C-alpha cells in the first residue's frame, strides 16, 4: 500500500510470497528458479542468501495477473478495467475556452531511501546483487528501477524502464530504445545546454503503484506520480535527490543518482529479451553513478526477460486488460480483446466482436493497427465473433479453420512500421502485417449457406457449473 | 482383455472416475465430459444416470494416454510402427457374456437404454459408438465401420451410412442380389478397446487383433449370421427393411455445426442381447476438440512414418483436433537450404490423399513442438513476415462440405513458413535463441525440492 | 441566434441573404437558381413569390462555409475547431465509481410554431411549397426538417 515492504508483508500473508533462505547465485541461477516458478503460477520470490551479497534479491513480483492487479490497489484482474475507464477519462479533463463558461506530489524532507548513502570515491555497484540472466549475456544487468529524467525546459519529469548494463564500479549503460521518454529529455538537454552533463536518477524497489504507473501508459495531461496516487488511493510521497533536483519515491529501496556525460557511449553487449533471442551488440549512453542511496536492510528488486511466459509478459497481459475498455469505448462491437504472451506480448492479437454487417472484420483490423500506439507493431490480428473464446486457442483455431477461406478472408498490407529489432522482417523498421478475419461470412461475403453453430445450453452449463465441485473429478 | 477389464486397469492408474451423483444423459453428460476432456480429465463412468438403470461410459479416449493404454502399448507414438507395418482371424466363441440377457419382438424398447443427447438442438438421442456389422450378399467377409444411429422408435434407429463404400455398399448389392429381402444388421456396444479402436482405422477384425497380438473373439448373433465381438456390453440385432428410409433430423458434428436434414435407411431392432450389469458406452461430437478428434490424432500417427519415408527431413507431422483433426497441419523439419519449407508444404498438399484437403499448413524448425501452441505461435511471430512467408494457392480441391470455401469442393489453401530464414531468404542478422546451460539447470534440479516454493 | 428569423435578419444585414420577389416555380426551378448561386459563393436565397404558393421558400442557407460557421455561433470557419475540441471532451464527462471519490431543455407552454394549426380532416400538404429537384424525380420531396422520434 504505502511502500514495497508493505506490499510484501501483504503478499506473504496471502501465500503469494516465498523466502529462499537457501544459498542461491544471482548469476543466472535466480533466473532459473524464477523461470520455473513463473512457468507454474508461483509466488513472488525473495532470496535472502545470494551467493556473495548482503542484499536479498526480490523477483517475480508481478509473476501473476492476480499480483499485478493487487499491486494497483484492485486485488482483482477484472478491476483493471476500471483503470482503463479512468485512463480514458483522464485524457480530456477540461473543455476549450470557447465553451468553458458552463493529486499533488507530497514532497518530504527526509526519506528512508536516503538512510544509507555513499558517493563518488566509493560508489561500488558491485556491492549490489545485480543479476545475470542468460549464459551468453554480456554482464550483470539492472532490470527494474524507474529512471527519472527532466527536460531542459519542461517542469514535468519522466519515469522510464530502461535496462542497464554494468560496465564499471560506477558506470552503467542507459539503453533508451524509444525516441521518447528519457531518450527525448537527453537529446533535448544536449541542445539547450550542450556539453553540460545530463542529470539522471534510477529508483529501485518503489511502491507497486509508482512502478505500475511507470508501466501503464498515461496521458500527457497527468504526471506519472499523480496517476500512481489514484491507483494507490493516496498521493505518492516523493523526495528530492542529492546531486540534482529530480524527485524519486521516498519509500524506494535503493536510489541511484548520477549523470550522463555528453558523448560518452558504450556497446551494450548481447542480451536475451522478451522475444527469446539474444540482442546484438549496440552502442548506448553511459550512466555515471556518483551517488548510491538506500534504506536500512534494503532489498534489491530485480527481474529478467526471455522466451515468454515472462515476468514482463504477464505484466502485459494484466495491462492489456485495462486497454480493453479503452478499446471498446471506441469500437462498441468489441467483446474481448486479447494478446497472447506466446506471441511476445504484442506481436499477435485476437479480437472477438459482434459482427453487425458484412466487411465489419476489416474495420476492427485497421482499428487495432491504428487506434492505440501499443498495437502499431503487432503483425498478426485474428478477428472472431462473440461465440469464441479469444483466450482459448482451441476456440480460435476452430474459427480460423471452419469459418475462413485463406485467400479470400486474409488481409495483407505491406511496408508498415515494425519493431527495429524484429529480425524476421525484410528490412529493419519496415515490415508487413497480416489480418485474418474468421468471422461468420454474411450474404455478399459469401454465396453459400453458412453453418449453424452449436451453441451450448445456458441452463445446463449453469447446472453442472454448480454440481461441478461435488463431482470430484480432479 | 475386454472393455470391463480395460476399465479396471484404467482406474488402477487413476484414469477413471466413477460419478455417483445423478446426471442426465440428456446433454448434461456431454457438458460434463466436454469440460473433462478439454482439461485433461480421466475417462468417465456415470453410474447414476437420471431416468435410467445402467451406467454410462464416456470420454475413455479423451486423452492420447488412454488411447495408448487401449492396447497395452502405453506408447501413444507406437502406432508409427503400425503404419510401417502396412506392406490372422478371430475366435468365434460359442455363447458369449454379451448374451446373458436377450429380448425380442415388441419387448425391444430402446428407451430403456441411456442413449444420450449431445446438443440442445439435436434431433433426438443418438448412438455415437457401436460396432455396426454387415455381411455382403457375396463374399463371406463382413464389414465393421462406425455409423451414428438416430433414435426414432421403440425399436428403430436411423442408419446414417456416410460414404458409399463399406457397410453401405453391402445393403446396396444385397438389394440387387436379393431384391425385396430384409438386409441383416447388428450393432455391438462395448467391444474391447482393441476391437473398437481397430474399427476406426483405414487398412478390419484382423487389425484389431494385431493391436493386442492375440486374435479377437466374436460370437454368432441370435437372429442372424453376423459375428459381433464377444466382449460387447450389448448387441442390437435387427434388419434394415428394403426401401424403408427415415429423415435424419439435424445433428451437431465434429466441426461444431449442425448438419442439415437428410434421409437414411432405418434399422429395425428385433433383438437386444446384452449382459447382466451391462454398461452403456458412447461419446459426443461437437465443436472440437472432442473424444473422436483426440482419437484420430493418435490414429494419424500411422501416417507420420509414411511421410518420413518420402520427406526424411520431417521431424513431426501434427494435425491438432481444434482444426477438425484434418484441416490444419503443423510440420516441424530439419531445414537444409533456402525454400526448403515450400517443398514440404506442397508435399503435404499432394503426397498422401488423406492430407490433400488440409487448408492450413505451418512449417517450423525441429526446435519447436508442433503439439505446443506456445512454441508454434512463438515461431510464427518471431521468424515470419506475413508478406513473403505466406503461400496462398487458389482454386484447389477442398472438402465438399466445407461451407467456408467460395465454391463447393473448390477453394484455397494457405502455407505458413515459420522456419528460421537463411541467407537467401533474409538479408539480415537472424537472431540467436536463448539457450540455458545444463549445469545450472541440473543444479536447481537437485535443489528444487529443498526450495519449498510450492510445497 | 434564438430562431431562424433572427438568423436571416443577421445574414441579410451582412449581405449573405437575397430576396427573389420575382415569380419562381418550386418545381425544379428553385434548384436551378440555387445551384448556380451555390456554384459561385452566393447568399442564402429567399423566394417570396413561389408560383402557386403563399409560403416563401428559403434555401441555400448553408451554401457557404462562412454561413455554416455563423449558424453555430462562431462566425468563423476556423472556430469550428473549437467545436471539435468540445465534442471530444463531451465523450468522457465523469470517471468510474472506483476513482470517483476525488444544459436542460427549457420547455415552454406556448410556442409560435403552434400559432396556426390544422389537423386530420384538413391537413393538405399540397399547401406547403414542397419543391421538386430534378426532372426525373418522383414527386415533391421535403428535404430539411428534423424528424423527432422516441424509443419504446
CSV table of C-alpha atoms in Angstrom, one decimal, chain A residues 92-413:
chain,number,residue,atom,x,y,z
A,92,UNK,CA,-10.0,15.1,-21.8
A,93,UNK,CA,-10.2,16.8,-18.4
A,94,UNK,CA,-11.3,20.4,-19.4
A,95,UNK,CA,-13.2,21.9,-22.3
A,96,UNK,CA,-12.0,24.7,-24.7
A,97,UNK,CA,-12.1,28.3,-23.7
A,98,UNK,CA,-15.0,28.9,-26.1
A,99,UNK,CA,-17.5,26.8,-24.2
A,100,UNK,CA,-15.7,26.7,-20.8
A,101,UNK,CA,-18.2,29.2,-19.3
A,102,UNK,CA,-20.7,26.4,-18.4
A,103,UNK,CA,-3.5,14.9,-6.8
A,104,UNK,CA,-0.2,16.7,-6.0
A,105,UNK,CA,3.2,15.0,-5.2
A,106,UNK,CA,3.8,15.2,-1.4
A,107,UNK,CA,7.5,16.0,-1.1
A,108,UNK,CA,9.0,15.1,2.2
A,109,UNK,CA,12.2,16.4,3.8
A,110,UNK,CA,13.6,13.1,5.0
A,111,UNK,CA,13.2,9.7,3.3
A,112,UNK,CA,14.1,6.2,4.2
A,113,UNK,CA,15.7,5.8,0.7
A,114,UNK,CA,18.4,8.1,2.0
A,115,UNK,CA,19.1,6.3,5.2
A,116,UNK,CA,22.4,4.9,3.9
A,117,UNK,CA,24.5,6.9,1.5
A,118,UNK,CA,27.8,6.7,-0.4
A,119,UNK,CA,29.1,8.9,-3.2
A,120,UNK,CA,31.9,9.5,-5.7
A,121,UNK,CA,35.1,7.9,-4.4
A,122,UNK,CA,33.2,4.9,-3.1
A,123,UNK,CA,30.1,4.0,-5.1
A,124,UNK,CA,30.8,0.4,-5.9
A,125,UNK,CA,27.9,-1.0,-7.9
A,126,UNK,CA,29.5,-4.4,-7.3
A,127,UNK,CA,28.1,-4.4,-3.8
A,128,UNK,CA,24.5,-4.6,-5.3
A,129,UNK,CA,23.5,-8.2,-6.2
A,130,UNK,CA,22.7,-7.2,-9.8
A,131,UNK,CA,21.9,-10.5,-11.6
A,132,UNK,CA,23.0,-12.0,-14.9
A,133,UNK,CA,20.1,-13.7,-16.8
A,134,UNK,CA,21.3,-15.9,-19.6
A,135,UNK,CA,24.6,-17.8,-20.3
A,136,UNK,CA,25.5,-15.6,-23.2
A,137,UNK,CA,24.6,-12.3,-21.6
A,138,UNK,CA,27.3,-9.6,-21.6
A,139,UNK,CA,27.3,-8.8,-17.9
A,140,UNK,CA,25.1,-8.1,-14.8
A,141,UNK,CA,22.1,-6.0,-15.9
A,142,UNK,CA,19.8,-3.9,-13.7
A,143,UNK,CA,16.3,-4.7,-15.0
A,144,UNK,CA,13.8,-2.9,-12.8
A,145,UNK,CA,14.1,0.6,-11.3
A,146,UNK,CA,12.4,3.5,-12.8
A,147,UNK,CA,14.8,6.0,-14.5
A,148,UNK,CA,13.9,9.6,-13.7
A,149,UNK,CA,14.9,12.5,-16.0
A,150,UNK,CA,13.7,16.0,-16.7
A,151,UNK,CA,13.6,18.0,-19.9
A,152,UNK,CA,15.7,21.2,-20.5
A,153,UNK,CA,12.6,23.3,-20.2
A,154,UNK,CA,9.6,21.3,-19.1
A,155,UNK,CA,8.9,21.2,-15.4
A,156,UNK,CA,7.4,17.7,-15.6
A,157,UNK,CA,9.6,14.6,-15.2
A,158,UNK,CA,9.5,11.2,-16.8
A,159,UNK,CA,9.7,7.7,-15.4
A,160,UNK,CA,11.2,5.0,-17.6
A,161,UNK,CA,12.1,1.4,-17.5
A,162,UNK,CA,15.4,1.0,-19.4
A,163,UNK,CA,17.7,-2.0,-18.8
A,164,UNK,CA,21.1,-1.0,-17.5
A,165,UNK,CA,24.3,-2.9,-18.2
A,166,UNK,CA,27.1,-3.0,-15.6
A,167,UNK,CA,30.2,-1.7,-17.2
A,168,UNK,CA,32.1,-0.4,-14.2
A,169,UNK,CA,32.3,0.1,-10.5
A,170,UNK,CA,30.2,3.2,-11.1
A,171,UNK,CA,29.2,3.1,-14.8
A,172,UNK,CA,26.0,1.6,-16.3
A,173,UNK,CA,24.7,1.7,-19.8
A,174,UNK,CA,21.5,3.7,-20.4
A,175,UNK,CA,19.5,1.8,-23.0
A,176,UNK,CA,16.9,4.4,-24.2
A,177,UNK,CA,15.4,2.4,-27.0
A,178,UNK,CA,12.4,4.6,-27.7
A,179,UNK,CA,12.7,8.1,-29.2
A,180,UNK,CA,10.6,9.4,-26.3
A,181,UNK,CA,10.8,9.4,-22.5
A,182,UNK,CA,14.3,9.8,-21.1
A,183,UNK,CA,15.8,9.5,-24.5
A,184,UNK,CA,14.0,12.6,-25.6
A,185,UNK,CA,14.9,14.6,-22.5
A,186,UNK,CA,18.6,13.8,-23.2
A,187,UNK,CA,18.7,14.8,-26.9
A,188,UNK,CA,16.8,17.9,-25.8
A,189,UNK,CA,19.1,18.8,-22.9
A,190,UNK,CA,22.0,18.4,-25.3
A,191,UNK,CA,20.5,21.2,-27.4
A,192,UNK,CA,19.6,23.6,-24.6
A,193,UNK,CA,22.8,23.1,-22.7
A,194,UNK,CA,25.3,21.4,-25.0
A,195,UNK,CA,28.3,19.9,-23.2
A,196,UNK,CA,26.8,20.1,-19.7
A,197,UNK,CA,26.2,16.7,-18.1
A,198,UNK,CA,22.6,15.4,-18.1
A,199,UNK,CA,21.2,14.6,-14.7
A,200,UNK,CA,19.7,11.2,-14.2
A,201,UNK,CA,18.3,9.1,-11.3
A,202,UNK,CA,17.1,5.5,-11.0
A,203,UNK,CA,14.9,4.3,-8.2
A,204,UNK,CA,14.9,0.5,-7.4
A,205,UNK,CA,12.1,-1.0,-5.3
A,206,UNK,CA,9.5,1.7,-5.2
A,207,UNK,CA,5.8,1.2,-4.2
A,208,UNK,CA,3.9,-1.1,-6.6
A,209,UNK,CA,1.8,1.9,-7.8
A,210,UNK,CA,4.7,4.1,-8.8
A,211,UNK,CA,6.2,1.0,-10.5
A,212,UNK,CA,2.9,0.1,-12.3
A,213,UNK,CA,2.3,3.7,-13.0
A,214,UNK,CA,5.6,3.9,-14.8
A,215,UNK,CA,4.5,0.8,-16.7
A,216,UNK,CA,0.9,1.7,-17.7
A,217,UNK,CA,0.8,4.4,-20.4
A,218,UNK,CA,-0.7,7.7,-19.1
A,219,UNK,CA,-1.9,10.8,-21.0
A,220,UNK,CA,0.4,13.8,-21.0
A,221,UNK,CA,-2.4,15.6,-19.1
A,222,UNK,CA,-1.1,13.9,-15.9
A,223,UNK,CA,2.2,13.2,-14.2
A,224,UNK,CA,3.4,9.6,-13.7
A,225,UNK,CA,3.5,10.1,-10.0
A,226,UNK,CA,0.0,11.6,-10.0
A,227,UNK,CA,-1.5,8.6,-11.7
A,228,UNK,CA,0.1,6.4,-9.0
A,229,UNK,CA,-1.9,8.4,-6.5
A,230,UNK,CA,-5.2,7.5,-8.0
A,231,UNK,CA,-4.2,3.8,-8.1
A,232,UNK,CA,-2.8,3.8,-4.6
A,233,UNK,CA,-5.6,5.9,-3.2
A,234,UNK,CA,-3.2,8.4,-1.6
A,235,UNK,CA,-0.7,11.0,-3.0
A,236,UNK,CA,2.7,9.4,-3.7
A,237,UNK,CA,5.4,10.5,-1.3
A,238,UNK,CA,8.5,11.6,-3.2
A,239,UNK,CA,11.7,13.2,-2.1
A,240,UNK,CA,14.4,15.5,-3.5
A,241,UNK,CA,17.6,13.9,-4.8
A,242,UNK,CA,21.1,14.8,-3.6
A,243,UNK,CA,23.0,15.7,-6.7
A,244,UNK,CA,20.0,17.0,-8.6
A,245,UNK,CA,16.5,18.3,-8.4
A,246,UNK,CA,14.9,15.2,-9.8
A,247,UNK,CA,12.3,13.6,-7.4
A,248,UNK,CA,12.3,9.9,-6.5
A,249,UNK,CA,9.9,8.0,-4.4
A,250,UNK,CA,10.8,8.3,-0.7
A,251,UNK,CA,9.9,4.7,0.1
A,252,UNK,CA,12.2,3.5,-2.7
A,253,UNK,CA,14.5,0.7,-1.6
A,254,UNK,CA,17.7,1.9,-3.4
A,255,UNK,CA,18.2,5.0,-5.5
A,256,UNK,CA,21.0,5.7,-8.0
A,257,UNK,CA,21.9,9.3,-8.7
A,258,UNK,CA,24.3,10.4,-11.3
A,259,UNK,CA,24.7,11.9,-14.7
A,260,UNK,CA,25.3,11.1,-18.4
A,261,UNK,CA,28.5,12.7,-19.9
A,262,UNK,CA,27.5,14.1,-23.3
A,263,UNK,CA,29.0,11.9,-26.0
A,264,UNK,CA,30.1,9.1,-23.6
A,265,UNK,CA,28.7,5.9,-25.0
A,266,UNK,CA,29.3,2.2,-24.7
A,267,UNK,CA,28.4,-1.0,-26.6
A,268,UNK,CA,25.5,-2.8,-24.9
A,269,UNK,CA,26.8,-6.4,-25.1
A,270,UNK,CA,24.4,-9.1,-26.2
A,271,UNK,CA,21.4,-9.8,-24.1
A,272,UNK,CA,18.4,-12.0,-24.5
A,273,UNK,CA,15.0,-10.2,-24.2
A,274,UNK,CA,11.2,-11.0,-24.4
A,275,UNK,CA,11.5,-12.4,-27.9
A,276,UNK,CA,13.5,-15.3,-26.6
A,277,UNK,CA,16.6,-14.4,-28.7
A,278,UNK,CA,19.8,-12.5,-27.9
A,279,UNK,CA,20.0,-8.9,-28.9
A,280,UNK,CA,23.0,-8.0,-30.9
A,281,UNK,CA,25.6,-5.5,-29.6
A,282,UNK,CA,24.8,-1.9,-29.9
A,283,UNK,CA,26.1,1.5,-28.6
A,284,UNK,CA,24.2,3.5,-26.0
A,285,UNK,CA,24.8,6.3,-23.5
A,286,UNK,CA,26.7,5.5,-20.3
A,287,UNK,CA,25.3,6.4,-16.9
A,288,UNK,CA,27.8,7.6,-14.3
A,289,UNK,CA,26.7,6.8,-10.8
A,290,UNK,CA,28.0,9.5,-8.4
A,291,UNK,CA,25.6,8.6,-5.6
A,292,UNK,CA,24.0,5.4,-4.2
A,293,UNK,CA,21.4,6.0,-1.6
A,294,UNK,CA,19.4,3.2,0.1
A,295,UNK,CA,17.3,2.0,3.0
A,296,UNK,CA,18.4,0.1,6.1
A,297,UNK,CA,18.2,-3.6,5.3
A,298,UNK,CA,17.1,-2.6,1.7
A,299,UNK,CA,16.2,-5.4,-0.7
A,300,UNK,CA,17.1,-5.4,-4.4
A,301,UNK,CA,14.2,-5.7,-6.7
A,302,UNK,CA,15.1,-7.4,-10.0
A,303,UNK,CA,13.6,-9.3,-12.9
A,304,UNK,CA,14.5,-10.8,-16.3
A,305,UNK,CA,13.3,-11.2,-19.9
A,306,UNK,CA,13.4,-14.3,-22.1
A,307,UNK,CA,11.2,-16.6,-24.1
A,308,UNK,CA,7.7,-15.9,-22.8
A,309,UNK,CA,5.9,-16.6,-20.4
A,310,UNK,CA,8.0,-13.8,-18.9
A,311,UNK,CA,7.8,-11.6,-15.8
A,312,UNK,CA,7.0,-8.7,-18.2
A,313,UNK,CA,4.9,-10.8,-20.4
A,314,UNK,CA,2.4,-11.4,-17.6
A,315,UNK,CA,2.6,-7.7,-16.7
A,316,UNK,CA,1.5,-7.1,-20.2
A,317,UNK,CA,-1.4,-9.5,-20.1
A,318,UNK,CA,-2.6,-7.7,-17.0
A,319,UNK,CA,-2.0,-4.3,-18.7
A,320,UNK,CA,-4.0,-5.3,-21.7
A,321,UNK,CA,-6.9,-5.9,-19.5
A,322,UNK,CA,-7.0,-2.1,-19.0
A,323,UNK,CA,-6.9,-1.3,-22.7
A,324,UNK,CA,-9.9,-3.4,-23.4
A,325,UNK,CA,-12.4,-0.8,-22.1
A,326,UNK,CA,-10.4,2.0,-23.8
A,327,UNK,CA,-10.7,0.0,-27.0
A,328,UNK,CA,-14.4,-0.8,-26.5
A,329,UNK,CA,-15.4,2.8,-25.9
A,330,UNK,CA,-14.1,3.3,-29.5
A,331,UNK,CA,-15.4,0.2,-31.1
A,332,UNK,CA,-18.5,-0.9,-29.1
A,333,UNK,CA,-18.6,-4.0,-31.2
A,334,UNK,CA,-15.5,-5.4,-29.5
A,335,UNK,CA,-16.4,-8.0,-26.9
A,336,UNK,CA,-13.0,-9.2,-25.9
A,337,UNK,CA,-9.5,-8.1,-27.0
A,338,UNK,CA,-6.6,-10.4,-26.1
A,339,UNK,CA,-2.9,-10.5,-26.9
A,340,UNK,CA,-1.3,-13.9,-26.1
A,341,UNK,CA,2.1,-13.9,-24.4
A,342,UNK,CA,3.4,-16.7,-26.7
A,343,UNK,CA,3.2,-14.0,-29.3
A,344,UNK,CA,5.7,-12.0,-27.4
A,345,UNK,CA,3.2,-9.9,-25.6
A,346,UNK,CA,2.4,-7.7,-28.6
A,347,UNK,CA,3.2,-9.5,-31.9
A,348,UNK,CA,-0.3,-11.0,-32.2
A,349,UNK,CA,-3.9,-10.1,-31.2
A,350,UNK,CA,-7.2,-11.9,-31.2
A,351,UNK,CA,-10.3,-9.7,-31.4
A,352,UNK,CA,-13.9,-11.0,-30.9
A,353,UNK,CA,-16.7,-8.7,-31.9
A,354,UNK,CA,-20.4,-8.7,-32.5
A,355,UNK,CA,-20.5,-8.6,-36.3
A,356,UNK,CA,-23.3,-6.4,-37.5
A,357,UNK,CA,-22.6,-6.1,-41.2
A,358,UNK,CA,-20.5,-7.6,-44.0
A,359,UNK,CA,-16.9,-6.4,-44.1
A,360,UNK,CA,-17.0,-5.4,-40.4
A,361,UNK,CA,-13.9,-7.5,-39.5
A,362,UNK,CA,-11.7,-5.3,-41.6
A,363,UNK,CA,-12.7,-2.2,-39.6
A,364,UNK,CA,-11.6,-3.7,-36.2
A,365,UNK,CA,-8.5,-4.7,-38.1
A,366,UNK,CA,-7.5,-1.2,-39.1
A,367,UNK,CA,-8.7,-0.2,-35.7
A,368,UNK,CA,-6.2,-2.3,-33.9
A,369,UNK,CA,-3.2,-1.2,-36.1
A,370,UNK,CA,-4.0,2.5,-35.6
A,371,UNK,CA,-6.0,3.4,-32.5
A,372,UNK,CA,-3.5,2.9,-29.7
A,373,UNK,CA,0.3,3.2,-30.1
A,374,UNK,CA,0.9,0.0,-28.2
A,375,UNK,CA,-0.5,-2.0,-31.0
A,376,UNK,CA,1.2,-0.5,-34.0
A,377,UNK,CA,3.8,-3.2,-34.2
A,378,UNK,CA,1.6,-6.2,-33.9
A,379,UNK,CA,1.8,-8.0,-37.2
A,380,UNK,CA,-0.9,-10.6,-36.7
A,381,UNK,CA,-4.6,-9.9,-36.0
A,382,UNK,CA,-7.4,-12.5,-35.9
A,383,UNK,CA,-11.0,-11.3,-35.9
A,384,UNK,CA,-13.7,-13.6,-34.5
A,385,UNK,CA,-17.3,-13.5,-33.3
A,386,UNK,CA,-18.6,-13.5,-29.8
A,387,UNK,CA,-19.1,-17.2,-29.7
A,388,UNK,CA,-15.4,-17.9,-29.4
A,389,UNK,CA,-13.0,-17.5,-26.5
A,390,UNK,CA,-10.3,-15.2,-27.6
A,391,UNK,CA,-8.2,-16.6,-24.8
A,392,UNK,CA,-8.6,-20.3,-25.8
A,393,UNK,CA,-6.5,-21.4,-28.8
A,394,UNK,CA,-9.0,-24.3,-29.2
A,395,UNK,CA,-11.7,-21.8,-30.0
A,396,UNK,CA,-9.6,-19.5,-32.1
A,397,UNK,CA,-8.1,-22.3,-34.2
A,398,UNK,CA,-11.6,-23.8,-34.7
A,399,UNK,CA,-12.8,-20.4,-36.0
A,400,UNK,CA,-9.8,-19.9,-38.3
A,401,UNK,CA,-10.4,-23.4,-39.7
A,402,UNK,CA,-14.1,-23.6,-40.1
A,403,UNK,CA,-15.3,-20.1,-40.9
A,404,UNK,CA,-12.5,-18.8,-43.1
A,405,UNK,CA,-11.1,-19.0,-46.7
A,406,UNK,CA,-7.4,-18.2,-46.7
A,407,UNK,CA,-7.1,-16.3,-49.9
A,408,UNK,CA,-10.5,-14.8,-49.5
A,409,UNK,CA,-10.5,-13.8,-45.9
A,410,UNK,CA,-6.9,-12.8,-45.3
A,411,UNK,CA,-5.7,-9.2,-45.5
A,412,UNK,CA,-2.1,-8.5,-46.2
A,413,UNK,CA,-0.8,-4.9,-46.1
